[PDB]
Each structure stands twice: as structure tokens, then as C-alpha cells.
Design a protein around this ligand. Structure first.
Ligand SMILES: Cc1ccccc1-n1c(Cn2nc(-c3ccc(O)c(F)c3)c3c(N)ncnc32)nc2cccc(C)c2c1=O
Length: 822
């Protein structure tokens, strides 16, 4: 059994477990055994969970951030069902009560023994919440549809559980010996070296003597640093850059001065370098795995006596306000002078005090750490700032996680993408963040699902493949069952890649109708029908993809030729008719981040009672320029609608009426008013979202509209101005908002009110967006690479202003946009 599981993990994670063994690396070895133990203990706890707790693990509640309604309810075993009138204010228990009373009369005669499953979905309604607090019940109300639910008994739930079982002394100036290299270039070589603690230099950047671009270079020279050995902090990073000159960067390499056991490193090292894009402090502290091709630098760390970093017990032994909300040197001195008052009276200003402490003086670090160990826990918002690379110390990182433990699963999920990116800043394999993420993932299967895919989707990136592979292995140890569920998804994705490659070849030699027929024949092979059917959606593990609907599958005969894959499910009814788009060839990371930020805006708006009728559809990178996008059904592009074709319900005398005519056709009679309202609200949401994020090149081919009237955007790829993008009002959109009238200030100014409300709410959470984007810098996105990009957000939310100034500013922009509109 154990051999089978090992091979299944290897295949699932995209890396052979023998490759971990072959490294013969104690740190890897230790990571693997500790984390396996941790994860297996979590699995043991899970298998004895009570049935309500199991539901909470496997099917966490989907909640929203009086009135009557029809609900259809059946029981798990039978066809017979009952359609009740209940209230949106009723609890699930009351609904389960009606259900059981009804079954008792038909079937000739305890609510608390049941949970309600949404038909055809891995989604359950349970707990003390009125029905309309559940996202599913909400969804039905706005769409019109009738909730269809299944009474599931506690013994059925337990059956699912059961089937799823598994030192201060050294004053000499720090120095190294640069021995030799083995590189490729055109000039003379120089090696620049610098010592870093995060972004901050611990002293000046001492450089090599120049040597000719011959060899196999040999230096054999001591590089002494302007810092005492007893002053090197625990997280000291040594950074090299090799380049040529008469500038031409060649390569870079970093390492920690202390190993993962706090021992100071000696003696000789061969550093396998990464090819360059001069110093890269944020770059990984692990060598380039391509040891065949990589340029290499051998260095020597001299034996300073074994020396370890002191234990905490030895460490622990050793106008303010007007500025406190970049600062001058005397201001910094005051903050450090007042550090005790900072702790006692301004605990949330911890980060500011950290940025003023002298990390290159061990005495000062001791004094900072002593305060840190008695520091009260901080709000989640503050802890997110502390995860930044500006805060490299392990005690700080440990404090940060401790304050983040109060994250709800919903919050953790909202920030998961960024927390995974922060792993790229980690210095060692076994770290507090990895343990935190793995623990949360093992306690919540939705978190487990998305953590898996965030890690899996980067296995083709050599710099993270080891770390991410090891995390995925450990996770698998803690849920054998979920591993198999994930394997099924991977098998479907393998088949989709093969199918997409086929379509790419066929469509170059034949017409779209012919290729589509070939696609269908390929899909109807038993191997494909089996691999593509009966899986949890990688986009949302609560959506079950049952039978693939071959005749509705197609492809886009342009660009990367993405696939359109439709599904149906008898058991789920209408809600089982769902689609996925598979695209191979594009980097989906930018799309994913944009969509996640818009989804976050939607949550923040709804928390203030503003529902802009957004369309937060799923986008999930799964592999190398590969991923899935959730299909929004019953929608069309603005461009297609504006073609204004004849013989259609929407055919118009003036082209400006095409979109309104289309909406009229989909929403006859009294339905038009609501659709125009959905259009207006969503238009405001997307106009604000794209303005704030600097998303340019919006046009009629990348905006879509649903038959409900809701507008949404597709195909992102440009943001934070990396095409200053103006606020955009489109004439055809103004025309719909104005109900097809030339002048309609009543409707138009309501729309302006929505924009202003949305904008002011985002500003209030400005710091959250800034902290999240700061963390996202870890991801290596070319459109989020520096301070200029963060500055874009600062400017767009006008955060340096009062609310009144910001709104005047926003108003000029909005007004300028209206003029520009034809
Ligand atoms: C559905 C449609 C109407 C009008 C013009 C184009 C499309 N459309 C679109 C338009 N589109 N794009 C997206 C989409 C959104 C974000 C992306 O990153 C992305 F790659 C695609 C999309 C979506 N999520 N839901 C519904 N429609 C969407 N996408 C296709 C993808 C694969 C295969 C096909 C045949 C299509 C396709 O026909």
C-alpha cells in the first residue's frame, strides 16, 4: 500500500519522491519527517471528528459577507420531494422540521440529526443562520430559481468520514574568501558582494578585484566586511552578483550565514548561480538546481573558533504622535528612545519601530526582541504588514503568524494567494508560515484544495519546485483520500492538455466545423469520457463536474485556442449545467490576481450594504501557462451584441440602441427595469475597480454582459498602468444607464452616486490593498515589480488625502471621463 501511495504522490505533485532522497540533504530530510508527523496527527484528529465538525471540515459554510420563498426538499434515498413555502428569516432547522413532518404523514409516522445538502453540489446548509444568510439561498432569490435541497442524516455523514480514513565573543570584521568560478561571457569580470537583512544593507557592498573574462576564473582573495561577527543577526543573508564591464549582469546567488540549525556556516561553498534578469537580496537563498549548466562561484567561510546563535533566554537576558501616522534620522532616534512607550501606548506601531532598530548591532536587536516577546497581539491588518520581506527576523515572523491565527477561514481564503507567495521569501524549509498553512489546510478541505493548486501550479519554476513539492507531499500524508480526489482532477487536466494540443494542430489544417467534429470524436474515446467526467471542479471543489456534454464542447478558433467544456448533472438539475474553459499558452497569474482583488472589493462593498451585482467567476492557474476559468453562462460580448445583426430581436435603427435592444429582448415587460438596474450597479463596480487597479485597454471584446443585465470583464492582462489610466465612461453604457434617453440626469446621477460610494469604501480599506500588493511582489509578476507599481494604488485611492479632497479629485476624473464619452 505504501509503495502505491508514494507513486501516487509523485505523479500528483509532478515530482518523483526519489528526487528528494537523492539530495541527501539533512534539511530536506528533517523537513520531510517532521511535517509528515505533523500532518499525520492532524489526520488522526480528523477521523474522530463529530458529524457536525466533519461537515465543517469537508463542506465549510458558504455565507454572505420577513419574506416568503418556495423550497423543494427531498430525502437522500427517494425520488419523492416536497415543495414548501418558508421565510427567508427561517432557520434550516425549521425547514428540516417541515420536511420530517411531511415525510411522517406520507410515510405513515429529529431535525437536529440532519443537514441540508444543495442538490448535486458539495455544499450544505446547517447552523443557526436565517436561510437568506446562505449564499445559495441568496443566489436563488436574485436569479428567480427555487432552492432544491436534500435532507441528509448524520449516519450518512459519518459514513463519508469513515470511508475517507488514511557568538557574542567575535569582534573580528566578518570576511570570506572568494576562490574561483566557471562562467560564460564576452571585458573583465567583477564579483560584488553585500550583506543584507531584508531590503537593508548591514554595511557597504565590498567588491572583487577585476579579472579577465578567461576561464574558469580564479580570485583567491579575502573579502572583509564592515561589521563585527558577533553583530551578524540570526537572519543574515550574504548576496553575490557576478557581472562584466569595460554594464552587463551575468548571475547572482544568495545564502544564509547561519544554517537551519542556527550554526554559523564554514568553510567552503560552491554556489550554483542564477542567470541575471545587480544584487538581489529578495532572491532565493538556495542554489540553481541546474548544476550542469549554471555558472558557479566557490567561496570560503573561515572557522571563527561550533558557534550557534544564542537561545532566546540569553537574548532576553541581554512630536512622537505627530510623526507616527519615511522619517528623518532624529525622528528615528526619538522612536527608538521611546520604544517602551511605543509598546505600552502604541502597540500597533510595532512595524515602524522595527524599521528604525539597528539590525546590524546585536545589542540593539537584543533590546528589540525583549520588547517583542511581551508585545500584545496585533490586528490581522497589522500582522499582514509584518509578513513583508522588510521584516526578515524569525521572531518577528513568528509574532506575525501568532497574530494571524485569529484569521477566519473565510479571511484566510481571501488572502491565501498572497500567503503562498510569501513562502518565496522564506530562508529555511521548516518555517512557521508553512506549518500554519499546512495546519489550516488539514483542518479545512477548501483551504487544502486551493493551497494544493497554488503550489502545484508553480512546479515548473525551478526556484520553488523543491519547497512546494515538499509541502504538497506533507499535505498528501495528512489526507490520502483528498490526494485521490486531486489525482482525478490532474488526470482530467492531463487529458485537456492533450485534447487542446490536438485542436491546435487540427485547426491549422482544417475548418473549425471539421476540427470541432474531430474534437468530439477524441472526447468520445473511453479513456477521455472517463478522465473528463465525475470530478470536483478545480475552480470550486463544491461544484461537481459530472457528465461531460460532448456536443456542447467547442474551442475558440483564435489566439491560444482555448477549450469550452460543458457538463451536466441529473441530480443537480439546472445548477449542474456548468462550464469550464481550459487555456494553455497564456500566463493566468495576472487574471487570477485581478479577479481576486475585484472579489475582495465586492466583499468590502457588501459589508457596508452595497451590492454592485458583480460577477466573481473563478480563474485558477494549474500548471505551466495552463489553467481553468469558470464559464459565465447566458452571457455575450458587448462587441458581438454591437454587430447589430439583422433577423434578430435586438436589430436597431441606430447602433447606439443595440445593447439596450438586446437587454429588452432578454427582459421583456416589467423585467426591463431590474436589468437596467443590474447593469447600472455592475457598471459602477467595474468602472471603479478598473480605475483603481489601473486596468487599461478595456474595449467591447473584453467586456461581457449577462442576460440579467450584469456587466463584467474578461481577459485581463494589464494593470497598475502597465499597459496612468483615466476613469472610463463608455457612451453605449451611459445610454443604457439613461434608459435610452439623451438626457436623464436622475438615472445618471444615481449611477455617479454608486461610483462615489464604491470608491469611498475602497479608500477606507486602502491599507489592506497596499499590504496585499506588497506581499504579491514576491510572485515575480512583471507588472508588479517595484515601488512605482505600489505607488499607482496609492495615487488611485488618493490615500494621502482627506475623504473630502479625495472625492473632489475623483469627481474631476469622473467629469473628465463624461466629457470624453463621445
Ligand atoms: C462565450 C463567448 C461569447 C462571445 C464571444 C466569445 C465567447 N467566448 C469566450 C468569452 N469568455 N471569455 C472568458 C474568459 C475570461 C477570463 C479569461 O481569462 C479567459 F481566458 C476567458 C469567459 C468566461 N469566463 N465566461 C464566459 N465567456 C467568456 N471564451 C471562450 C473560451 C473558450 C472557448 C470559446 C468558444 C469561448 C467563447 O466563445
Amino acid at each position: 500500500v505504501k509503495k502505491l501511495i508514494n507513486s501516487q504522490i509523485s505523479l500528483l505533485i509532478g515530482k518523483g519522491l526519489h528526487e528528494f532522497d537523492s539530495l541527501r540533504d539533512p534539511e530536506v530530510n528533517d523537513f520531510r519527517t517532521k511535517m509528515r508527523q505533523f500532518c499525520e496527527e492532524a489526520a488522526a484528529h480528523r477521523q474522530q471528528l463529530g458529524w457536525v465538525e466533519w461537515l465543517q471540515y469537508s463542506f465549510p459554510l458558504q455565507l454572505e459577507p420577513n419574506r416568503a420563498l418556495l423550497v423543494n426538499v427531498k430525502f437522500e434515498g427517494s425520488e419523492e420531494s416536497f415543495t414548501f413555502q418558508v421565510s427567508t428569516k427561517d432557520m434550516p432547522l425549521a425547514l428540516m422540521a417541515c420536511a420530517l413532518r411531511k415525510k411522517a404523514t406520507v410515510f405513515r409516522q429529529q431535525p437536529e440529526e440532519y443537514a441540508l445538502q444543495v442538490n448535486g453540489r458539495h455544499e450544505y446548509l446547517y447552523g443557526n443562520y436565517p436561510l437568506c444568510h446562505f449564499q445559495y439561498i441568496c443566489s436563488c432569490l436574485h436569479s428567480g430559481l427555487t432552492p432544491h435541497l436534500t435532507m441528509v442524516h448524520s449516519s450518512s455523514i459519518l459514513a463519508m468520514r469513515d470511508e475517507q480514513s488514511n557568538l557574542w565573543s567575535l569582534e573580528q570584521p566578518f570576511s570570506i574568501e572568494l576562490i574561483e568560478g566557471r562562467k560564460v561571457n564576452a571585458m573583465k569580470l567583477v564579483v560584488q558582494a553585500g550583506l543584507f537583512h531584508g531590503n537593508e544593507m548591514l554595511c557597504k557592498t565590498v567588491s572583487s578585484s577585476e579579472v579577465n573574462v578567461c576561464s574558469e576564473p580564479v580570485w583567491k582573495q579575502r573579502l572583509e566586511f564592515d561589521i563585527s561577527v558577533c553583530d551578524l543577526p540570526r537572519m543574515a543573508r550574504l548576496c553575490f552578483a557576478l557581472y562584466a564591464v569595460v554594464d552587463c549582469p551575468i548571475a547572482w546567488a544568495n545564502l544564509m550565514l547561519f544554517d537551519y540549525k542556527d550554526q554559523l556556516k564554514t568553510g567552503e561553498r560552491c554556489l550554483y548561480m542564477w542567470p541575471s534578469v545587480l544584487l538581489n537580496p529578495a532572491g532565493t537563498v538556495r542554489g540553481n538546481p541546474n548544476t550542469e549548466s549554471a555558472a558557479a562561484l566557490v567561496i570560503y567561510l573561515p572557522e571563527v573558533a561550533p558557534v550557534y546563535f544564542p537561545a532566546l533566554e540569553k537574548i532576553l537576558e541581554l512630536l512622537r504622535e505627530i510623526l507616527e501616522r519615511e522619517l528623518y534620522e532624529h525622528e528615528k532616534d526619538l522612536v527608538w528612545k521611546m520604544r517602551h512607550e511605543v509598546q505600552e501606548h502604541f502597540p500597533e506601531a510595532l512595524a515602524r519601530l522595527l524599521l528604525v532598530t539597528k539590525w546590524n548591532k546585536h545589542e540593539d536587536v537584543a533590546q528589540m526582541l525583549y520588547l517583542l516577546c511581551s508585545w500584545p497581539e496585533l490586528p490581522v491588518l497589522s500582522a499582514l504588514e509584518l509578513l513583508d520581506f522588510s521584516f526578515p527576523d524569525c521572531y518577528v515572523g513568528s509574532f506575525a503568524i501568532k497574530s494571524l491565527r485569529k484569521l477566519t477561514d473565510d479571511e484566510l481564503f481571501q488572502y491565501l494567494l498572497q500567503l503562498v507567495q510569501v513562502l518565496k521569501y522564506e530562508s529555511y524549509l521548516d518555517c512557521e508560515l508553512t506549518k500554519f498553512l499546512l495546519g489550516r489546510a488539514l483542518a479545512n478541505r477548501k483551504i487544502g484544495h486551493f493551497l494544493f493548486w497554488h503550489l502545484r501550479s508553480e512546479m515548473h519554476v525551478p526556484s520553488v519546485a523543491l519547497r512546494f513539492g515538499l509541502i504538497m507531499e506533507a499535505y498528501c500524508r495528512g489526507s490520502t483520500h483528498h490526494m485521490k480526489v486531486l489525482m482525478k482532477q490532474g488526470e482530467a487536466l492531463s487529458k485537456l492538455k492533450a485534447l487542446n494540443d490536438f485542436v491546435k494542430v487540427s485547426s491549422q489544417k482544417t475548418t473549425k466545423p471539421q476540427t470541432k467534429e474531430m474534437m468530439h470524436m477524441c472526447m468520445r474515446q473511453e479513456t477521455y469520457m472517463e478522465a473528463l467526467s465525475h470530478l470536483q471542479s478545480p475552480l470550486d471543489p463544491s461544484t461537481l463536474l459530472e457528465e461531460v456534454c460532448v456536443e456542447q464542447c467547442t474551442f475558440m478558433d483564435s489566439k491560444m485556442k482555448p477549450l469550452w467544456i460543458m457538463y451536466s448533472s441529473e441530480e443537480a438539475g439546472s445548477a449542474g449545467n456548468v462550464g469550464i474553459i481550459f487555456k494553455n499558452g497564456d500566463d493566468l497569474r495576472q487574471d487570477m490576481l485581478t479577479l481576486q482583488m475585484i472579489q475582495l472589493m465586492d466583499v468590502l462593498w457588501k459589508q457596508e450594504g452595497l451590492d454592485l451585482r458583480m460577477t466573481p467567476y473563478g480563474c485558477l492557474p494549474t500548471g505551466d501557462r495552463t489553467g481553468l476559468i469558470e464559464v459565465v453562462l447566458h452571457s455575450d460580448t458587448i462587441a458581438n451584441i454591437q454587430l447589430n445583426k439583422s433577423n434578430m430581436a435586438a436589430t436597431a435603427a441606430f447602433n447606439k440602441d443595440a445593447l439596450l435592444n438586446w437587454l429588452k429582448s432578454k427582459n421583456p415587460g416589467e423585467a426591463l427595469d431590474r436589468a437596467i438596474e443590474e447593469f447600472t450597479l455592475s457598471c459602477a463596480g467595474y468602472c471603479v475597480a478598473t480605475y483603481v487597479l489601473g486596468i487599461g485597454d478595456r474595449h467591447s471584446d473584453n467586456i461581457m454582459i449577462r442576460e440579467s443585465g450584469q456587466l463584467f470583464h474578461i481577459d485581463f492582462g494589464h494593470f497598475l498602468g502597465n499597459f496612468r489610466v483615466p476613469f472610463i465612461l463608455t457612451y453605449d453604457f451611459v445610454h443604457v444607464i439613461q434608459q435610452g434617453k439623451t438626457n436623464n440626469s436622475e438615472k445618471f446621477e444615481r449611477f455617479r452616486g454608486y461610483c462615489e460610494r464604491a470608491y469611498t469604501i475602497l479608500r477606507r480599506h486602502g491599507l489592506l490593498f497596499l499590504h496585499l500588493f506588497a506581499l504579491m511582489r514576491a510572485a515575480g509578476l512583471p507588472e508588479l515589480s517595484c515601488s512605482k507599481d505600489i505607488q499607482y494604488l496609492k495615487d488611485s485611492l488618493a490615500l494621502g488625502k482627506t475623504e473630502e479632497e479625495a472625492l473632489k479629485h475623483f469627481r474631476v476624473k469622473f467629469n473628465e471621463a463624461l466629457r470624453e464619452s463621445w
